[PDB]
Structure formats: C-alpha cells, structure tokens
Amino acid sequence: MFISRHSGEGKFLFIDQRATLVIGFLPQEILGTSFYEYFHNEDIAALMESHKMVMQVPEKVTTQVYRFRCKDNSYIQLQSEWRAFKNPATSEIDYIIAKNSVF
C-alpha cells in the first residue's frame, strides 16, 4: 500500500507520501540505497530471481510475500508488483515501478 520506484539495479529513486509511515525511513535515509539493503536473509535469493525476471521481460512480476527490514530493524511483510520500462533508443531501464502491498 505504498509506491516506490527504483533504478534497473534496485536503487531507490522515489517513495510516495505513505511509505515512511509503513517502513520508518525518511526519503533522505532510503533514496540512493539498494533494495538489497532491506530484504530478510530468508527472502533475498528468491527476490533476486524476481528482479532478474523484471529486467529481462517487459511484463509485471509479482514477488512472493517477503520480509522487509524497517528503520527500527524489525521486519514487516510486503508483496510487490514490479515492472521495468526501457528507453526504446538505448535499451537501458529508465525505472522500475513497485506497488508494495502491506500485511
């Protein structure tokens, strides 16, 4: 129930106005960091496979429900819909949109 956007490699570029209440981080704390800084140890391998798919195919990918580390170093459960958009003249990823649903 918050939107974020990331670079092709997973770096946070944007969090919406609802995100800080969920995850605790202010934008200045999280923008510029990799999403790999936050995933739980037990979910990171599966999430990397979802990310690989996002980068390869131009369709939406829905992750498993995973644990995300909040500013207080506890975890919350999220499920994310990810989709990448590529510049048609360079093939590089402009951004990935993420719709992050909270449990």
CATH of the domain at 43: 3.30.450.20
CA gap 60, 54 in Å, rounded: 7
CA gap 64, 7 in Å, rounded: 20
CA gap 83, 81 in Å, rounded: 7
Handedness of CA 57, 60, 38, 8 (dihedral sign): positive
Beta-carbon contacts of 73 under 8 Å, excluding residues fewer than 6 positions away, are none
C-beta contacts of 67-71 below 8 A and 24+ residues apart: 67/39, 67/40, 67/42, 67/43, 68/23, 68/38, 68/39, 68/40, 69/37, 69/38, 69/39, 69/40, 70/22, 70/23, 70/24, 70/25, 71/23, 71/24, 71/25, 71/29
Token readout for 99 is: 């719709």
Which residues are 101's β-sheet partners?
79
The whole domain housing 14 covers 1-103
This PDB structure is determined at a resolution in Å of 1.4
Residue 47 CA to chain centroid, in angstroms? Answer: 9
Q: Based on the structure, what is the number of domains in the chain? A: 1
Q: Identity (one letter) of the amino acid at 92? A: E
